[PDB]
DNA sequence: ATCGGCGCCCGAACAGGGACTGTG
DNA sequence: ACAGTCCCTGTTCGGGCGCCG
């Protein structure tokens, strides 16, 4: 199968650059005879041409085993050429998911053999792919070659082959507008609604069409029967599942090992409902030593046990039905952790997932729930091209008082309430008017910019005062610390007057969790109270108790 | 017709903006549009060897079912070269109508050395196929350079109608033609059809509005009335009895308003809170404090003097969510030197969709900035970045896109709406 | 050791902007 | 008026998972 008659993609170097001139590093003898045998072979196949001293460029070459294969993959350390090659706009915008596949009568999975080695390379650019094979005898100079096809390891090869494959399939796709072809690199998911007999006729038309364009479809890579191994999934006729996940078992773990376990748990969370990785990812904080050994914490081990528990049972996904509505339901599992399932028929999930991002230093469950709703919305647009209907564990009245009372514009699409505890609630609520018969606290705090030492205190209308000295603190922390004092030394109903927009803006957002230990203490006090009114006055304006407490803490 | 040479500003590359996900409704509409533009030679397919990209998406036209392809040419326009009088009476006209003449640009070819920068990529659902990339061969809608290159042809097309109707103000901004007159609403709508047919002798206009008697809120960006735009004054509460808390809110409001109004004084009001009183304690206003408040009421009622527009400085607009579907906004160039303070209320998605409201308010604020000054302001949006980027395309219907940033404002700005 | 391109997650360095404070 | 410190958000790059040559 000669090289593809497709037009070469024009490739340039970065402006004002030349090609790579890197010397060849030593190679082992097992690989030298294999590269020589391979290079003379892939010269016979036309992929490679011999070059002379006129070519002043070079790139080091080696040869590794092909992925899960007895064939050798010829790889080149084109790190120097990639820096000098023009940038491309990658056309691969994402990864196809089986949950977005519709039901089809006939399914075929193809794979093009020697994909990159079938597409020619721009003739003017071939000079820069020059490389030298050092011989065994150091006295021999070594054989120089250049590439005639897309080399493996070049930054432009994936995009050019992807672009080239689309041009090859365009005529066939037009000749068969009703045949669905999911195209990712060299793997071809072909689906039609024809009968099984007439479908193999069109597949052969497709294989012959690709063969005319220099794209062979080997029988070793031709799948004709479900189950289908496609994009790391197992595609049964009416259900889909993930290829076997292998979690490592070790007595002691390292940073790298934790990093692999978190990743595989994320890859599993697309269909396994309930995966948690918050406590396992916490072990990756601070330690940049990849081979450092980490003892599993009590919370981390519990998380690993939970994941293995739901991984021992097999889970399957369903395909997409364009006629039926898309539904997603979210549940609050842990603090800051969420899991969701997208389905059409109950208990027949298309896919699952999780959102466990802490957005901001201070937040609440309603914010995180709205952040997770948006992540699902975007993910749903990619897979199914439409926004799903929502089933959320938050009261209709809970959300109404939040979005109407919140200063930012927040919205959630069409959703219905489901009574699946734990529900999302506002743990406390600030009064809109000052409380009658509630002790009024005028709080403030200060800190020195050089000394980092500060004070924080309050004065009340009942004459009560307090000032606490603080060490290693800031201005922002002392104003929060002053509000904490007023909440501590008050009854169940208190009026607090601060001059810190920073402290006011944090509390007014009704957070229930915070990266700051002090704010979490303030949150804990606010939930214990029965009525709290927080008011703001401008500092340094001779206003009420603000002036009395200002002189107490600035000294 | 030979193409006009276009360069980028010195030392700047083309735009490289990723394409954001689109709905099947929008993708199927875009593929049909781009395939027709390729047949008529208006665009052409390109490959990954073009390293530039600009996001594309589709919107449903104003009071119509047809789709309009909208390019987010914000990045290309910042990096595009600059080319080479604003009608002050357009904002004084009774009725002003916006006509989409962006279709006229598709008749002028674009400079070959420049077409590489107009590349965009159409995505596919579930990443079935790679992105199909196109570039423009003619003047594109939404490009900063398109109205400038076409300016010579536009003055020529409009001159007979403008001399035949000298009382009609006609301003052009990007794809839109702003047509203002003082005629009655019915005679005004007839004059718009006279201009459309006069334009039709050369270049086509967006399909006739299916409704001709102005349904409610379908003509938001279509039929606008500038002579009825009102500014939102700063107001102070009027109470028979004042508490310590009520005076503190008043003093804090007046001290903030003193940054916009010079003569605001709060000393006699602050004297009323000199103790360490309870927030709910009623405080009688002294004779000195009552006078200080009444003069401040006069100052907040009087307009600000000495605030003029600077054509060299960018415009900035800030919006505040006031609740109950009401949104306050201010347009300025220097802090506390507002060129206009307005209020928009009761917008679409009543008491359900906050985002639909904000998206409409941004468009309404932008329309005013184009009508009044001929610029677009940079918006400080009171919304989360992901909340806005997820939904804003679903409610956008303008041919332009203003620059924006996202801010988390503390809700102590009760100082703009009562 | 020793590769390309894409997407996702989680963690952290860096930068940008706004407000407060101290100072000429 | 200018210069810092703090805090906060956002972007970018690194690890990992997964896909494919
Ligand atoms: O909305 C932020 C978002 O905008 C992007 C792409 O949409 O950049 C474009 O939009 C900005 C919004 O103002 C413009 O400033 C910018 O010029 C334009 O390219 C991304 O930067 C960002 O994700």
Author numbering:
A (entry chain A): 0 to 554
B (entry chain B): 5 to 88, 95 to 428
From the study:
Fragment 166, ((1 R,2 R)-2-phenyl-N-(1,3-thiazol-2-yl)) cyclopropanecarboxamide, occupies P-pocket. A comparison of the 166-bound structure with the RT/DNA P-1 complex structure with no compound bound, hereafter referred as the apo structure, shows the expansion of the pocket upon fragment binding. The deoxyribose ring of the primer 3′-end nucleotide has shifted by ~2.7 Å to accommodate 166. The five-membered thiazole moiety of 166 interacts with the deoxyribose ring and with the primer grip. The central cyclopropyl moiety is positioned over the conserved YMDD motif of the polymerase active site and interacting with the active-site residues Y183, M184, and D185. Consequently, the YMDD motif has bent down by ~1.6 Å compared with the apo structure. One Mg2+ ion that was chelating all three catalytic aspartates (D110, D185, and D186) in the apo structure, is dissociated upon binding of 166. The phenyl ring of 166 points toward the first template-overhang thymine base. This thymine base, which is less ordered in the apo structure due to lack of interaction, has shifted by ~2.2 Å and aligned with the phenyl ring of 166. Despite no canonical base-pairing or a typical hydrogen-bond interaction between the thymine base and the phenyl ring of 166, both aromatic rings are aligned and stacked against the dsDNA base pair, suggesting that modification of the phenyl ring of 166 to form base-pair-like interaction with the template base would improve binding. Compound 166 in P-pocket almost mimics the binding of a nucleotide and the predominant interaction of 166 is its stacking with the terminus base pair at the P-1 position.
HIV-1 reverse transcriptase (RT) copies the viral ~10-kilobase ssRNA genome to a dsDNA in a multistep process. For the DNA synthesis, RT binds an eighteen-base-pair stretch of a duplex substrate with the primer 3′-end nucleotide occupying the priming site (P site). A dNTP complementing the first template overhang binds the N site and the nucleotide part is catalytically incorporated by RT at the 3′-end of the primer with the release of pyrophosphate. Following each nucleotide incorporation, the DNA is translocated from N to P site to accommodate the next dNTP.
